[PDB]
Amino acid sequence: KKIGLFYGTQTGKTESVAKIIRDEFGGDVVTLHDLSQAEVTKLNDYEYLIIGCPTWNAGKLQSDWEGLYSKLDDLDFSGKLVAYFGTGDQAGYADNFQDAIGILEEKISQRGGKTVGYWSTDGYKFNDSKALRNGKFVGLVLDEDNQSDLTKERIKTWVAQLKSEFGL
């Protein structure tokens, strides 16, 4: 079973996290795709996906994901299991915390993808997020700006969860 992890990054934090996620899964189970360089239609090449995106400029997708968002309408994610992760800043942007993964999950689910890897809100403080579904985040949310001391344990916990939900 091959997992494709597709990310965008401006300041490198989501990329750093992507690499830890890859390591934590082990071997060559996860292949990384930076959408500054990767073709978006490679999303079709996997039945198991991990979508990484930080939120920028008070509620916007990271620029690589923003530029490719319209192309999601052309893809069929039916039959795929999709997980999400984001980096964000809950102190600076409490009204838009992790919006970007929420935006992406809404569209990918509309295009047939099935979300796995929902994540508790416990231990975050924010006002609003477009990433909430029935009181859980759509996926792992990291905050390297305020909570960098929690990132490693959070990733370990989530990868264990994903191994179960993906049926590895």
Task: Give residues in contact with ligand FMN (CB under 6 A).
Answer: 9-14, 54-59, 62, 87-89, 92-93, 96-99, 144-145
Tokens of 112: 């047939």
- Ranked by CB distance to ligand FMN, the top (closest) residue is 88
Q: How far is the CB of 129 from ligand FMN (least distance, A)?
A: 8
98 or 166: CB nearest ligand FMN: 98
Q: How far is the CB of 152 from ligand FMN (least distance, A)?
A: 15
Q: Parallel, antiparallel, or unpaired: how do β-strands 119-120 and 114-115 relate?
A: unpaired
Q: d(Cα 66, Cα 62) in Å, to the nearest integer?
A: 6
Q: How far is the CB of 51 from ligand FMN (least distance, A)?
A: 13
Tokens of 24: 């934590």
118 or 126: CB nearest ligand FMN: 126
Q: How far is the CB of 65 from ligand FMN (least distance, A)?
A: 11
66 or 145: CB nearest ligand FMN: 145
11 or 110: CB nearest ligand FMN: 11
